[PDB]
């Protein structure tokens, strides 16, 4: 499946501001608004992201616009980064999606900082890479959102998304 379909499964789609697994205000398909507990701060961040007055609710079209911007930023981010680009180029199609997903979730600097996992992936040490990812705060603070990505790095199949 494609990266949009994969992230839709991991992140869900919600049109109103909600709290994610870590308690953080989120909207759309995994678009983090703020780590502040102030709902009104999340609303102000949403109005900034869209450029108009939203009162904490967006349309599916606006959700998809944010999603497509966030995916584009992850893909361009990988492909200009001296650590991530050789890893991405080395991976098979399925694990390339898992890499984009991980960068979407953690950010470029978060993924580029896991230099052990990157070496393992480059070297085809899939089991070792998955064990190491399962030690991360990313996974342990919110297992349901990360578990399919980890399985996908291990197996190289789409089975966890079926």
Curated annotation (Swiss-Prot):
It is an enzyme of class 3 (hydrolase). Keywords: Antimicrobial, Bacteriolytic enzyme, Cytolysis, Glycosidase, Host cell lysis by virus, Host cytoplasm, Hydrolase, Viral release from host cell. It catalyses: Hydrolysis of (1->4)-beta-linkages between N-acetylmuramic acid and N-acetyl-D-glucosamine residues in a peptidoglycan and between N-acetyl-D-glucosamine residues in chitodextrins. It is found in: Host cytoplasm. Changing residue 20 to E/Q: Loss of 99% of enzymatic activity. Optimum pH is 7.3. Changing residue 30 to F: Almost complete loss of enzymatic activity. The enzyme is destabilized by 1.5 kcal/mol. Its EC number is 3.2.1.17. The keyword Hydrolase applies. GO terms for molecular function: lysozyme activity. Changing residue 26 to E: Complete loss of activity at neutral pH; covalently bound substrate. GO terms for biological process: cell wall macromolecule catabolic process; defense response to bacterium; peptidoglycan catabolic process; viral release from host cell by cytolysis. The active site is at residues 11, 20. Substrate binds at residues 32, 104, 117, 132. GO terms for cellular component: host cell cytoplasm. Endolysin with lysozyme activity that degrades host peptidoglycans and participates with the holin and spanin proteins in the sequential events which lead to the programmed host cell lysis releasing the mature viral particles. Once the holin has permeabilized the host cell membrane, the endolysin can reach the periplasm and break down the peptidoglycan layer. Belongs to the glycosyl hydrolase 24 family. This is Endolysin. It comes from Enterobacteria phage T4 (Bacteriophage T4). The gene is E.
């Amino acid at each position: 499946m494609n990266i949009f379909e994969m992230l839709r499964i991991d992140e869900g789609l919600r049109l109103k501001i909600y709290k994610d697994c870590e308690g953080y205000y989120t909207i759309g398909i995994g678009h983090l608004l703020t780590k502040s507990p102030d709902l009104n701060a999340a609303k102000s961040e949403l109005d900034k992201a869209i450029g108009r007055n939203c009162n904490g609710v967006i349309t599916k079209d606006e959700a998809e616009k944010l999603f497509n911007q966030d995916v584009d930023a992850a893909v361009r981010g990988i492909l200009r980064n001296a650590k991530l680009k050789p890893v991405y180029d080395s991976l098979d199609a399925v694990r390339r999606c898992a890499a984009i997903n991980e960068v979407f979730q953690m950010g470029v600097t978060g993924v580029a900082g896991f230099t052990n996992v990157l070496r393992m992936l480059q070297q085809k040490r899939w089991d070792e890479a998955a064990v190491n990812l399962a030690k991360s705060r990313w996974y342990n603070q919110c297992p349901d959102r990360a578990k399919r990505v980890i399985t996908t790095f291990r197996t190289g199949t789409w089975d966890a998304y079926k």
